[PDB]
Amino acid sequence: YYEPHPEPIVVKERVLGLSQILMINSENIANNANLTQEVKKLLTEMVNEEMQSLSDVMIDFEIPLGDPRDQEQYIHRKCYQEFANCYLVKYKEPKPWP
Amino acid sequence: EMQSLSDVMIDFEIPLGDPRDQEQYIHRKCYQEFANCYLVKYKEPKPWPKEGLIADQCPLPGNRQSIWDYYIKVESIRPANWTTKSKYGQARLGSFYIPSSLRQINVSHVLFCSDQLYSKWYNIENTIEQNERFLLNKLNNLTSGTSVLKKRALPKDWSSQGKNALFREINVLDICSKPESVILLNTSYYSFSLWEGDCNFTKDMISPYACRFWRSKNEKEETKCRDGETKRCLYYPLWDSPESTYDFGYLAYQKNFPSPICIEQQKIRDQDYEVYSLYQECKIASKAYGIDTVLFSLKNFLNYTGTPVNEMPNARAFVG
Amino acid sequence: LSQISDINDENLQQGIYLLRDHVITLMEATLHDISVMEGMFAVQHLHTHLNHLKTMLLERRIDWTYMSSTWLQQQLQKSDDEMKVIKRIARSLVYYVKQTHSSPTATAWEIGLYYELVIPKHIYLNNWNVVNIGHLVKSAGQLTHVTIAHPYEIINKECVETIYLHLEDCTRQDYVICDVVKIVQPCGNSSDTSDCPVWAEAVKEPFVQVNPLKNGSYLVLASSTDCQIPPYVPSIVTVNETTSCFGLDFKRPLVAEERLSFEPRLPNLQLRLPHLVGIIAKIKGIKIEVTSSGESIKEQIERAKAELLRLDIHEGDTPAWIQQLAAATKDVWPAAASALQGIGNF
Amino acid sequence: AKLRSMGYALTGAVQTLSQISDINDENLQQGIYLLRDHVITLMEATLHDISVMEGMFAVQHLHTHL
Amino acid sequence: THSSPTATAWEIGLYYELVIPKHIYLNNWNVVNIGHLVKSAGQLTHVTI
Ligand SMILES: *[C@@H]1O[C@H](CO)[C@@H](O[C@@H]2O[C@H](CO)[C@@H](O[C@@H]3O[C@H](CO[C@H]4O[C@H](CO)[C@@H](O)[C@H](O)[C@@H]4O)[C@@H](O)[C@H](O[C@H]4O[C@H](CO)[C@@H](O)[C@H](O)[C@@H]4O[C@@H]4O[C@H](CO)[C@@H](O)[C@H](O)[C@H]4NC(C)=O)[C@@H]3O)[C@H](O)[C@H]2NC(C)=O)[C@H](O)[C@H]1NC(C)=O
Ligand SMILES: *[C@@H]1O[C@H](CO)[C@@H](O[C@@H]2O[C@H](CO)[C@@H](O[C@@H]3O[C@H](CO[C@H]4O[C@H](CO)[C@@H](O)[C@H](O[C@H]5O[C@H](CO)[C@@H](O)[C@H](O)[C@@H]5O)[C@@H]4O)[C@@H](O)[C@H](O[C@H]4O[C@H](CO)[C@@H](O)[C@H](O)[C@@H]4O)[C@@H]3O)[C@H](O)[C@H]2NC(C)=O)[C@H](O)[C@H]1NC(C)=O
Ligand SMILES: *[C@@H]1O[C@H](CO)[C@@H](O[C@@H]2O[C@H](CO)[C@@H](O[C@@H]3O[C@H](CO)[C@@H](O)[C@H](O)[C@@H]3O)[C@H](O)[C@H]2NC(C)=O)[C@H](O)[C@H]1NC(C)=O
Ligand SMILES: *[C@@H]1O[C@H](CO)[C@@H](O[C@@H]2O[C@H](CO)[C@@H](O[C@@H]3O[C@H](CO)[C@@H](O)[C@H](O)[C@@H]3O)[C@H](O)[C@H]2NC(C)=O)[C@H](O)[C@H]1NC(C)=O
Ligand SMILES: *[C@@H]1O[C@H](CO)[C@@H](O[C@@H]2O[C@H](CO)[C@@H](O)[C@H](O)[C@H]2NC(C)=O)[C@H](O)[C@H]1NC(C)=O
Ligand SMILES: *[C@@H]1O[C@H](CO)[C@@H](O)[C@H](O)[C@H]1NC(C)=O
Ligand SMILES: *[C@@H]1O[C@H](CO)[C@@H](O)[C@H](O)[C@H]1NC(C)=O
């Protein structure tokens, strides 16, 4: 005799493994939203609250790929997120507003 | 939110009958699409007669009003030999210009979709599920097998036999909030003027604001330039500018102070309108041809002009 | 692998293959909606998004907000309905969470997420669970329960063809997932069917088993008759009016509406057992294998013969032995049985 | 390829009721009984709170619900 | 069911299965069989019901 089995059945071919790195930065978010120094403090409290809670229940695990610090895409996107619109200007010689 | 749910759930057969065959599915689908959608038919085609509109009851810019879309502004700087007659025909600069799109000669019917002309039975204070039942009963009580409303349903303006069972009567301030409604549905044009000259009212003939006309007439219309008859030249208007005051006619209308108001009637259309209900036609036609067809058929009729009436803003959803 | 596309290579095996390079994603770039919002309205919309990401990761699920669907489908080269199954059964791991900057007006964080996507080979939708019932046999005095050992656990029927599945190494991530699924044939006594082993076990008399089925019938197996139901062979029973059978109430079922069926119809099968199956099952005191579906008369007999011969006559239980010999002889030679039984009681 | 499961429609019979109240009938057995007619629901009607809210405040309240 | 740049509409089919209880039991214990040892004709034996 027989009874229905409503759940699907999947036969495995293989498994693909991926590593994604997510980078968060409040200052980039505060600039686009035209925030004030009072609301910047709220943004900062709010983001720490959520991130810390996740940090507090997850132990570390070794993953057998190379160090991100050696990869171009990691170097290019970190320099951008920190120093994209930062410049240094040098006067021909020092002269102040008169 | 909906797409994310769609993207992880395969389909399953459930062994009941098709919803498309069930009354409660047909009645609640027609309602959600066509509850407040109606079609009005003129006795014969007749458009709004003038291109200029005197309407002092509305407060001018100096909340936002819908009629400001048709408001001619008086500008100090103009080009050389510039006249109103060139641009805005016979309209009085500082009043309202009615476009030729709202005055078509061949328009026979008006199609609208809004809940802002219902008589006192309708209240937004009450519950959605009540306001549904209330309408659903009234539309059953005011019909008999077709989708044509009974003359009782209409206001006294649109029919001799109208008793406001469904619709209220359009009032004087409605032009400010709902322009197209009035211009397309009013049977007669009534004026409301505090302009020195109208009905032969002379400044002597009067038997902070007090007894005074809003805009007095100047000698003539002229410009002057300084060897640059092209771009920037001073303009001298044929009437005054209301920018300083801008509440005169609105405050006058409400009767805070006495003033020489002028009102004149002009008949446009015969009081013998006929009104169909698209909610009642959806229910009736779906019993014969099935909802999938009727829904698709009536959704196209709402896009007869090229812009669908049901996606317009509630106060401005009136089309000829 | 150097590309996600490489996972579909035909000469790969069943294992774990990692994409060689990390996927780098900025949230600012992902969440467009917030970009065009202003003030606290922007702040509250982000809060809702961050609180939802946290909820998914606690359950070990993937939030597909931060990865393009078109991209993944283009690379995997799958259908709309395969993708739905792939995205439902995928699982996540958070392998680090790091705060990279902390001012009173500004913060920045990094999260490392690791995903494992099962790629399906085949998906089976219309499935039945097997339930072995068996048959009672009364042999040389002993009541015995006999069962076939079927080489499948699931019967599948998508359209018209029925299929018998043997599963191995299975888990549950919403759906059942198995490493090994072998297609088999049902039991028989022929070259084109399975040659399955047959188990016997001794049971206590009287035996009664009644299972109420969901559609309103009853499944009965019983050592004795009641309400005209034959003994020893099992059967699916239905009644037109409520009555008491085997000391419980068999109710008339509620009228049903007929729909398209997917019930399996197994092949029939004759099965010859050894003459003294009841004595073989009794002297083991456990459930024991007695034949195969497709065994010869000669092999079947030369199987408990030596064992059975060495249950010989003894000085210490001659009367108890003689009474077994009679019960064994009754069907073969009834005249001899009646004699032996007499010399027993003397 | 277009998947669609018969996992809840496999047996080729169905026992239906005309009212939820009918489930408490004493001479029914232990099985699955389906209510014969679908329950039709508009969200606009269900969510009263939003009706009286305005602008983005209305929009954000619906987002939380969905 | 409809998709404009300013307007959308969706439909969802939900199927529910409600178990109706016959009896509910709250104060419950799990059984743990321990048994007894018996030393018989030299052999140690564990006996259980
Ligand atoms: C679209 O259509 C709607 C109709 O559905 C229309 O709304 C109506 O607009 C008219 C015109 O403004 C309104 O009628 C006027 O009401 C005035 C106030 O009514 C009170 O006072 C009267 C007594 O005076 C009472 O009976 C009444 O109960 C109220 O208490 C009223 O003053 C107006 O009456 C004057 O104007 C008419 C013009 O035909 C005239 O016949 C009268 O004799 C009267 O005298 C005139 O006075 C004016 C100055 O005030 C002067 O210029 C003129 O020379 C006088 N004429 C004479 C002969 O001496 C009038 O009845 C009506 O209430 C509105 N209806 C509703 C339901 O609200 C919209 O205006 C239309 N919109 C557009 C843009 O076309
Ligand atoms: C699975 O299916 C098999 C095949 O059907 C079943 O085994 C057979 O059982 C039947 C019924 O009990 C037996 O029938 C009898 O056959 C003999 C004649 O047998 C001789 O000739 C055969 C010709 O084909 C040959 O196959 C036989 O070979 C076997 O036996 C020899 C000797 O032991 C051995 O060396 C071989 O290796 C083979 O094993 C053999 O040479 C016949 O005399 C019988 O007649 C009686 O019955 C009829 C009909 O009622 C009646 O008219 C007569 O008067 C008489 O009473 C009878 O027909 C058959 O021998 C079996 N075959 C084999 C190969 O064993 C098996 O039982 C099934 N298994 C299960 C688990 O269900
Ligand atoms: C954060 O604040 C900045 C600074 O005000 C905002 O940028 C400004 O955005 C407005 C509206 O888009 C722009 O005004 C419009 O500009 C166009 C192009 O010149 C013009 O056609 C319009 O008539 C109107 O003037 C404005 O240009 C722009 N700022 C400046 C200084 O020019 C930004 O939108 C804010 N960010 C938000 C709300 O997320
Ligand atoms: C959406 O906008 C409409 C249009 O403004 C709102 O309807 C308006 O609601 C206000 C407040 O309830 C009403 O004002 C009050 O009316 C009563 C009855 O006449 C009166 O006693 C009060 O003194 C006050 O005037 C107003 O009547 C009504 N609109 C109109 C045109 O009359 C609606 O509330 C808004 N919806 C929201 C916020 O969800
Ligand atoms: C309403 O009607 C208009 C006019 O017929 C439709 O406009 C067309 O839309 C299609 C979209 O694929 C375009 O390819 C055409 O070029 C459009 N024509 C014009 C003249 O603009 C419009 O699609 C209809 N809208 C609805 C919702 O039915
Ligand atoms: C309006 O209808 C008349 C009479 O049928 C016709 O001559 C004319 O072309 C139509 N269109 C316009 C814009 O007048
Ligand atoms: C006075 O009003 C009447 C209204 O019929 C009009 O015919 C006449 O032309 C007006 N006269 C003047 C001098 O404005």
Going by C-beta distance under 8 Å and a sequence separation of 6 or more, which residues neighbour residue B313? none
| Positive or negative torsion for Cα B92, B97, B99, B102 | negative
Tokens 């007619």 identify what position?
Answer: D37
C-alpha B228/C-alpha B36 separation (Å) is 57
User: What would the two tokens of residue C198 be?
Assistant: 């047959």
Task: Please indicate whether residue C291, judged by its CB atom, sits closer than 6 Å to ligand 2.
Answer: yes
Within 8 A of E12 by CB-CB distance, chain B residues are: 5
> How many alpha carbons lie under 13 Å from residue B119 in its C-beta half-sphere?
14
Alpha carbon E24 to chain centroid, angstroms: 14
**D47-64 residues labelled b (16+ CB within 10 A) or e (exposed):** eeebeeeeebeeebeeee
- Distances in Å between the Cα of B187 and the Cα atoms of B37, B173, B181, B270, E29 are 21, 16, 11, 7, 85
C289 burial via Cβ count (<10 Å: 0-12, 13-18, 19+): exposed
C118 burial via Cβ count (<10 Å: 0-12, 13-18, 19+): buried
C111 burial via Cβ count (<10 Å: 0-12, 13-18, 19+): buried
Q: Which amino acid is present at C244?
A: S
C-alpha C321/C-alpha C58 separation (Å) is 70
Query: Residue D36: which region, alpha, beta or left (left: phi > 0; alpha: psi -120 to 50)?
Result: alpha
Residue B111 has a CB neighbour count (10 Å cut-off) of 20
Output the CA angle C212-C217-C220, nearest 5 degrees: 60
> Do B42 and B109 form a contact (C-beta atoms < 8 A)?
yes
Within 8 A of A6 by CB-CB distance, chain D residues are: 5, 7-8
Q: DSSP letter at B315?
A: G
Whether B129 and chain D come into contact, CB under 8 Å, resolves to yes
Helix (H, G, I), strand (E, B) or coil at B78: strand
B244 burial via Cβ count (<10 Å: 0-12, 13-18, 19+): exposed
| CB atoms B22 and D37 under 8 Å | yes
**Nearest-CA distance from C80 to chain D in Å?**
8
Q: Which amino acid is present at E19?
A: V
Going by C-beta distance under 8 Å and a sequence separation of 6 or more, which residues neighbour residue B45? B105, B106, B107, B108
Going by C-beta distance under 8 Å and a sequence separation of 6 or more, which residues neighbour residue E8? B2, E2
Output the CA angle E38-E42-E48, nearest 5 degrees: 20
Helix (H, G, I), strand (E, B) or coil at A48: helix
Q: DSSP letter at B262?
A: B
| CB atoms C81 and B10 under 8 Å | yes
| Lateral strand order in the sheet of C288-292 | C135-139, C142-148, C197-202, C288-292
Residue B96 has a CB neighbour count (10 Å cut-off) of 21
C-alpha C197/C-alpha C293 separation (Å) is 6
Nearest to A16 by CA among B43, C119, C33: C119
Task: Please indicate whether residue B202, judged by its CB atom, sits closer than 6 Å to ligand 6.
Answer: no
Residue nearest to atom 24 of ligand 5 (CA): B306
Task: Please indicate whether residue B308, judged by its CB atom, sits closer than 6 Å to ligand 5.
Answer: yes
User: What would the two tokens of residue C293 be?
Assistant: 């579906």
Q: Which residues pair with A20 in a beta bridge?
A: C23, C113
> Do D41 and B48 form a contact (C-beta atoms < 8 A)?
no
Task: Please indicate whether residue D52, judged by its CB atom, sits closer than 6 Å to ligand 4.
Answer: yes
- Distances in Å between the Cα of B2 and the Cα atoms of C100, C293, E8 are 35, 55, 11
User: What would the two tokens of residue B260 be?
Assistant: 């020489």
Q: DSSP letter at E39?
A: E
Nearest to D17 by CA among D28, D3, D5: D28
Interface of D with E in 2-21 (CB under 8 A): 8
User: What would the two tokens of residue B174 be?
Assistant: 């409605």
Output the CA angle D65-E1-E7, nearest 5 degrees: 65
The helix-helix angle for B23-34 and B291-301 (nearest 10°) equals: 10
Q: DSSP letter at B258?
A: -
Nearest to B317 by CA among B130, B106, B111: B111
C-alpha A96/C-alpha A90 separation (Å) is 13
> Do C93 and A61 form a contact (C-beta atoms < 8 A)?
yes
Whether B14 and chain C come into contact, CB under 8 Å, resolves to no
Tokens 């008491």 identify what position?
Answer: C244
| CB atoms D8 and B12 under 8 Å | yes
User: What would the two tokens of residue A28 be?
Assistant: 């980039």
Q: Where would I find the beta strands (DSSP E) of B155-262? A: 188-190, 222-224, 233-236
C-alpha A31/C-alpha D65 separation (Å) is 30
Going by C-beta distance under 8 Å and a sequence separation of 6 or more, which residues neighbour residue E17? D32
C-alpha C176/C-alpha C155 separation (Å) is 15
User: What would the two tokens of residue B179 be?
Assistant: 């322009």
Strands C154-157 and C127-129, by their bridges, are antiparallel
> Do C308 and C280 form a contact (C-beta atoms < 8 A)?
yes
Whether B9 and chain E come into contact, CB under 8 Å, resolves to no
Going by C-beta distance under 8 Å and a sequence separation of 6 or more, which residues neighbour residue C115? A17, A18, A20, C62, C90, C91, C92, C93
